[PDB]
């Protein structure tokens, strides 16, 4: 995985690649690593895939109940606090490495959380196996007072660095833009720079190629 | 980490580098290791980032609840709450914490809490991996009842050397000044402190 988060003028943007691996093999060439905790709080997850999804959903569920209970829009620091205390309790055994970002009545926020439960604050962050490739780009091109379109460009460039240079990362770039006063816009497959070329041959078999021993109609009705 | 806290005439100053480490990779070069557990009781964190954050959060909660019932807690009391957590959970924690606060009766006070969870009240304290390299320097240069400017220079020069020799320390030098006047945050960048 390569994931990044970048703050700008009036909000925050996060991005991620779309490769999931099992050892050296690519299982999904287009998985979604960008998760919705609340409408305007999103999170990018690296590490153990089931852990990032499950921890994201649990805190997202509790955040919704909390929002309904308090009659208030949820805050990023609440998601941050709930995630870190959950992860700390499990002493790193829940392998979720997250970049949490969003907007709320307090403003725009960008955090990262490690599996053992430590949190960081920053204007630009990167996690995952391609974080070094991404951080190299972020450290080279980041500046104070970025515009929306500049931050998206920087974020996706940082993800591309991971896609091309990290074997753990690949395929596409997903983006989510969270701007203050506006709806969060999730940009699924914002870039698709790894389209499979036309195959040289069709491997459609002549009908009857496969030897068959038995046929039978399966009853799915009651 | 390289951290320290130093008492002086008007109160106490806390100091720290800004490096977080994940092997030889710098996971965060602008970390804030100086942390508020009460208005004028702060702590320097060293060891595990997760452990020290979890401890500091629990202490802040305890002192907030203390304040609601009994008013402002003493610096000694804050150190006792840190100790209780560090001592009783010594098997599962990697946390070297320096507690520093300002009373009006007691003025500036510094308590250091090493790995085992023992408490040691001192005029000044140094801790973290980078502290090893400045024991000689700090012992030779520390004086009691220094001024604010002298104490800032003492911490700046000390952490500068700790940062210079310790690979696990670096970035900016953060400082927090605790006096009757209030709470002041100071920052010092590489271009200044490296050429000291």
């Amino acid at each position: 995985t390569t994931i990044v988060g970048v703050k700008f003028n009036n909000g925050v943007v996060i991005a991620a690649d779309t490769r999931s691996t099992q050892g050296p093999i690519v299982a999904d060439k287009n998985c979604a690593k960008l998760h919705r905790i609340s409408p305007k709080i999103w999170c990018a997850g690296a590490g153990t895939a089931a852990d990032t999804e499950a921890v994201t959903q649990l805190i997202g569920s509790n955040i919704e109940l909390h929002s309904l209970y308090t009659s208030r829009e949820p805050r990023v620091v609440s998601a941050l606090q709930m995630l870190k205390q959950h992860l700390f309790k499990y002493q790193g055994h829940i392998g979720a490495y997250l970049i949490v970002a969003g907007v709320d009545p307090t403003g725009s926020h960008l955090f990262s959380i490690h599996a053992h439960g430590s949190t960081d604050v920053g204007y630009y962050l990167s996690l995952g196996s391609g974080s070094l490739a991404a951080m190299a780009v972020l450290e080279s091109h980041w500046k104070q007072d970025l515009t929306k379109e500049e931050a998206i460009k920087l974020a996706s460039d940082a993800i591309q660095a991971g896609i091309w240079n990290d074997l753990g990362s690949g395929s596409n770039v997903d983006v989510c833009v969270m701007e203050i006063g506006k709806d969060a816009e999730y940009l699924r497959n914002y870039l698709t720079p790894n389209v499979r070329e036309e195959k040289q041959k069709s491997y459609k078999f002549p009908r009857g190629t496969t030897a068959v021993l038995k046929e039978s109609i399966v009853n799915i009705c009651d | 980490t390289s951290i320290m806290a130093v008492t002086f005439k008007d109160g106490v100053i806390l100091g720290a580098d800004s490096r977080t480490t994940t092997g030889a990779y710098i996971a965060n070069r602008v970390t804030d290791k100086l942390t508020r557990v009460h208005d004028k009781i702060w702590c320097c964190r060293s060891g595990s980032a997760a452990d020290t954050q979890a401890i500091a959060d629990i202490v802040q909660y305890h002192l907030e609840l203390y304040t609601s019932q009994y008013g402002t807690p003493s610096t000694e009391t804050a150190a006792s709450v840190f100790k209780e957590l560090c001592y009783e959970n010594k098997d599962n924690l990697t946390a070297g914490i320096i507690v520093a606060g300002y009373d009006d009766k007691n003025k500036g006070e510094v308590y250091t809490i090493p790995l085992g969870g023992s408490v040691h009240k001192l005029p000044y304290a140094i801790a973290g991996s980078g502290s090893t390299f400045i024991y000689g320097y700090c012992d030779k240069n520390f004086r009691e009842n220094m001024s604010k400017e002298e104490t800032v220079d003492f911490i700046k020069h000390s952490l500068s050397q700790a940062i210079k020799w310790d690979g696990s320390s670096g970035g900016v030098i953060r400082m927090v000044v605790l006096t009757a006047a209030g709470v002041e945050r100071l920052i010092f960048y590489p271009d200044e402190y490296e050429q000291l």
């Binding site: 490690h114 | 480490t21 965060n28 970390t31 060891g47 980032a49 020290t52 696990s168």
Partner: peptide, 4 residues
Amino acid sequence: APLX
């Protein structure tokens, strides 16, 4: 894990 992150250390200080």
